[PDB]
């Protein structure tokens, strides 16, 4: 089971509590975070609004449910989740250390006709980050949704960005646990940007991963980053 | 980056089969340049019940081929090969790399032809996409199973992408994009993957594999780029 990270938000109208969910596992099926994984999510998910980044409270039936501190107004906001860095041993004969980090970012439009770009287009500081350059509410089927990929604050050229949606691939309860089939794939340009072309309406997840050398070679050797951006089309 | 694919005209029973060798950027057919003629030193092959036969290079442009004889209703293969070429590569050192490319097109002659006897048998391409079903039976959103073979054996964990003519067209030029894919997934332990087409049209599936060259005394690395073209819908 690969175990990737993404973020989901329920339909929220202005003035009520924004409920969100931390998906850790196989998209799009949410699952409770296991006992041996809790230390990985030591820091709660964050809500990004005009006042900035604020912590969310882990309230709900399951341990992956979060609720906003105060009610939220209409606008376009971000919900971010982080898999805190973990170290593990790998090989291939001269085993080595790898640091895994994962990030999830969800675009949430609180209120109909809300398609702001001021907040959602600003980088939030994730090691590997997908910054939307437009609001998904304006993107119809067949239109292009430009995003930028940033690694360590700089644009990432030639990075493979894939994208899928809930209901595209429907199989493999647990028999393979393989990564889901993608409905889109393309590489970023020199400015780190790529146009996602959605062919279906629904809840979409875009994904990018980068593997590189760890900065401090005297502590660890490799670093792997998996990042997703979740949004709505239509 | 030039790649190999095959296109076939709409063909009925009793007429010659016209096919085109695409060497370049899909789906723009281009004449094979003077300095590239030696690479395509063997003609495109037509695979039928009687096996593999050479096609005849007839037409205004040098990428155009016809079958030797009029073809009957059925399901046939048209294959093209970019013959192995060696080039030097630097990292710092210098090593030999052999490049080979393959293309295969499933062509149904007759409006009701959905045979599988010919198109599902491997042809012997070093890197090959073997269809396990006829695409004429595949409607939009259904699964089209293929297997990937490398040196005759199934190739697991290989990335297969797919796109169609007309998917990415914006601002295409001699120095631009339109490599965007409408599908991407990895093969399983049996080398099989289900392409899920979301639109009708002229589709191309692609896979590549970089490995060590067999005879390390002569060359070091090998790179294979392989295509499968087909029609979805009518
Ligand atoms: Cu509503
Ligand atoms: Cu016809």
Automatic annotation (TrEMBL), chain A:
<dbReference type="Pfam" id="PF10670">
    <property type="entry name" value="DUF4198"/>
</dbReference>
<keyword id="KW-0732">Signal</keyword>
<dbReference type="InterPro" id="IPR019613">
    <property type="entry name" value="DUF4198"/>
</dbReference>
<protein>
    <submittedName>
        <fullName>Phosphoribosylglycinamide formyltransferase</fullName>
    </submittedName>
</protein>
